[PDB]
Amino acid sequence: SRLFVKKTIVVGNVSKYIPPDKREENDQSTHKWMVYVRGSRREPSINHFVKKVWFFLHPSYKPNDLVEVREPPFHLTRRGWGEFPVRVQVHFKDSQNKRIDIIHNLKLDRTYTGLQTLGAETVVDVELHR
Amino acid sequence: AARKSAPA
């Protein structure tokens, strides 16, 4: 039989506004954001099957536009000014499962209170060999 | 092209 299991992979982000009072000089960043990659609360945690996650950022982040998180939590925290598609590449411990690309549209806070707010979530099902 | 834009 060709047996598989579906697992949920959530790519989301949060962010908070950074008032001008708390920005350093010549820092064009208005926000601090965090992109996260995780499973659902109602199925097993994703360290069991994910080996690493690559983040591919906008070229404005060069030469640090390519970030590798090899161990949980699969999070990326950055200051910034703009929204853009974050490309997430999830590699699996069992190399039988081929790596998958997820595109996440970064959403930045517009309440501008300086508190952290939930931005967006991109949810996909992945198939793992069983 | 790689595009990026400020919400405000």
CSV table of C-alpha atoms in Angstrom, one decimal:
chain,number,residue,atom,x,y,z
A,1,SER,CA,0.0,0.0,0.0
A,2,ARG,CA,1.0,3.6,-0.5
A,3,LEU,CA,0.3,4.8,3.0
A,4,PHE,CA,0.6,8.5,4.1
A,5,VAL,CA,-0.3,10.8,6.9
A,6,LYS,CA,-1.5,14.4,6.6
A,7,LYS,CA,0.1,16.9,9.0
A,8,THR,CA,-0.6,20.6,9.3
A,9,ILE,CA,2.1,23.2,8.9
A,10,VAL,CA,1.3,26.8,9.9
A,11,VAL,CA,3.4,29.7,8.8
A,12,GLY,CA,2.3,32.9,10.5
A,13,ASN,CA,3.7,36.1,11.7
A,14,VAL,CA,3.2,38.7,14.5
A,15,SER,CA,4.6,42.2,14.7
A,16,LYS,CA,4.6,45.3,16.9
A,17,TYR,CA,5.1,48.9,15.9
A,18,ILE,CA,8.2,50.7,17.1
A,19,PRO,CA,7.5,54.3,18.0
A,20,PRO,CA,10.1,56.8,16.8
A,21,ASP,CA,11.2,57.3,20.4
A,22,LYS,CA,12.5,53.8,20.5
A,23,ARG,CA,14.3,53.6,17.1
A,24,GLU,CA,18.0,54.2,16.9
A,25,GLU,CA,19.3,56.9,14.6
A,26,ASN,CA,19.4,56.0,10.9
A,27,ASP,CA,17.2,52.9,11.5
A,28,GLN,CA,14.5,53.0,8.8
A,29,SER,CA,12.6,50.1,10.6
A,30,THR,CA,9.1,51.0,11.9
A,31,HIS,CA,8.3,47.4,13.1
A,32,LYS,CA,9.7,44.3,14.7
A,33,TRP,CA,8.2,41.1,13.3
A,34,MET,CA,8.5,37.4,14.0
A,35,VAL,CA,7.7,34.7,11.4
A,36,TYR,CA,6.9,31.3,12.9
A,37,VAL,CA,6.6,27.8,11.5
A,38,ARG,CA,4.7,25.3,13.6
A,39,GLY,CA,2.1,22.5,13.5
A,40,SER,CA,-1.4,22.5,14.8
A,41,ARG,CA,-2.2,22.4,18.5
A,42,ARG,CA,-4.3,19.2,17.9
A,43,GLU,CA,-1.7,17.0,16.3
A,44,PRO,CA,1.9,16.0,17.4
A,45,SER,CA,4.6,18.7,17.5
A,46,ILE,CA,6.6,19.2,14.4
A,47,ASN,CA,10.1,18.7,15.7
A,48,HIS,CA,9.3,15.0,15.2
A,49,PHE,CA,9.4,15.2,11.4
A,50,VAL,CA,10.9,18.6,10.4
A,51,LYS,CA,14.7,18.7,10.1
A,52,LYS,CA,15.2,22.3,9.3
A,53,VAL,CA,13.5,25.4,7.9
A,54,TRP,CA,15.0,28.0,5.5
A,55,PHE,CA,13.7,31.5,5.3
A,56,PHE,CA,14.2,33.5,2.1
A,57,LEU,CA,13.8,37.2,2.6
A,58,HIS,CA,13.5,40.3,0.4
A,59,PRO,CA,16.9,41.4,-1.1
A,60,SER,CA,16.7,44.5,1.2
A,61,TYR,CA,17.9,42.0,3.9
A,62,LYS,CA,21.1,41.1,2.1
A,63,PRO,CA,23.6,39.7,2.9
A,64,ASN,CA,21.3,38.2,5.6
A,65,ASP,CA,18.3,37.4,3.4
A,66,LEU,CA,18.8,33.6,3.8
A,67,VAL,CA,18.3,32.2,7.3
A,68,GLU,CA,18.4,28.6,8.5
A,69,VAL,CA,16.8,27.5,11.7
A,70,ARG,CA,17.9,23.9,12.3
A,71,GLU,CA,16.3,23.3,15.8
A,72,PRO,CA,13.0,24.3,17.4
A,73,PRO,CA,11.5,26.8,17.7
A,74,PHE,CA,11.4,27.5,13.9
A,75,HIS,CA,11.2,31.3,14.4
A,76,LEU,CA,12.7,34.4,12.7
A,77,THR,CA,12.6,37.8,14.4
A,78,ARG,CA,13.6,40.9,12.4
A,79,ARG,CA,13.1,44.6,12.4
A,80,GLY,CA,11.7,46.0,9.1
A,81,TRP,CA,9.6,48.6,7.4
A,82,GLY,CA,7.8,46.6,4.7
A,83,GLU,CA,5.5,43.7,3.8
A,84,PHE,CA,6.7,41.1,1.3
A,85,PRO,CA,6.3,37.4,0.5
A,86,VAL,CA,8.4,35.3,2.9
A,87,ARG,CA,9.5,32.1,1.3
A,88,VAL,CA,9.7,29.2,3.8
A,89,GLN,CA,11.4,25.9,2.8
A,90,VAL,CA,10.6,23.1,5.2
A,91,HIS,CA,13.0,20.1,5.1
A,92,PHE,CA,12.0,16.8,6.7
A,93,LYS,CA,14.1,14.4,8.8
A,94,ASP,CA,13.0,11.5,6.7
A,95,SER,CA,14.5,12.5,3.3
A,96,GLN,CA,11.9,10.3,1.7
A,97,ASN,CA,9.6,13.3,2.2
A,98,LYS,CA,10.7,16.0,-0.3
A,99,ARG,CA,11.1,19.6,1.0
A,100,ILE,CA,8.2,21.9,0.5
A,101,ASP,CA,8.0,25.6,-0.3
A,102,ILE,CA,5.5,27.8,1.5
A,103,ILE,CA,5.0,31.5,0.6
A,104,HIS,CA,3.8,33.7,3.5
A,105,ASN,CA,2.6,37.3,2.9
A,106,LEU,CA,4.1,39.2,5.9
A,107,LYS,CA,1.4,41.4,7.5
A,108,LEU,CA,2.6,44.3,9.7
A,109,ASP,CA,0.8,46.0,12.6
A,110,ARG,CA,-1.5,49.0,11.8
A,111,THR,CA,-2.7,49.7,15.4
A,112,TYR,CA,0.6,51.5,16.0
A,113,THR,CA,0.3,51.1,19.8
A,114,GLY,CA,3.6,49.4,20.2
A,115,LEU,CA,1.9,46.2,21.4
A,116,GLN,CA,2.4,42.9,19.5
A,117,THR,CA,-0.5,42.0,17.2
A,118,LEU,CA,-1.3,38.9,15.2
A,119,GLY,CA,-0.6,39.5,11.5
A,120,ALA,CA,-1.4,36.5,9.2
A,121,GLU,CA,-1.3,32.7,8.9
A,122,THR,CA,-0.7,30.5,5.9
A,123,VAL,CA,-1.8,26.9,6.6
A,124,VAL,CA,-0.9,23.9,4.4
A,125,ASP,CA,-1.3,20.2,4.7
A,126,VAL,CA,1.9,18.1,4.1
A,127,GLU,CA,2.0,14.4,3.3
A,128,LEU,CA,4.5,12.2,5.1
A,129,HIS,CA,5.4,8.6,4.2
A,130,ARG,CA,4.2,6.1,6.7
B,1,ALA,CA,10.9,41.7,-9.4
B,2,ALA,CA,11.0,41.3,-5.6
B,3,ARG,CA,8.5,43.9,-4.3
B,4,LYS,CA,8.1,45.2,-0.8
B,5,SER,CA,5.9,48.0,0.6
B,6,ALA,CA,5.1,49.9,3.8
B,7,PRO,CA,1.5,49.4,5.0
B,8,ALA,CA,1.3,53.1,5.8
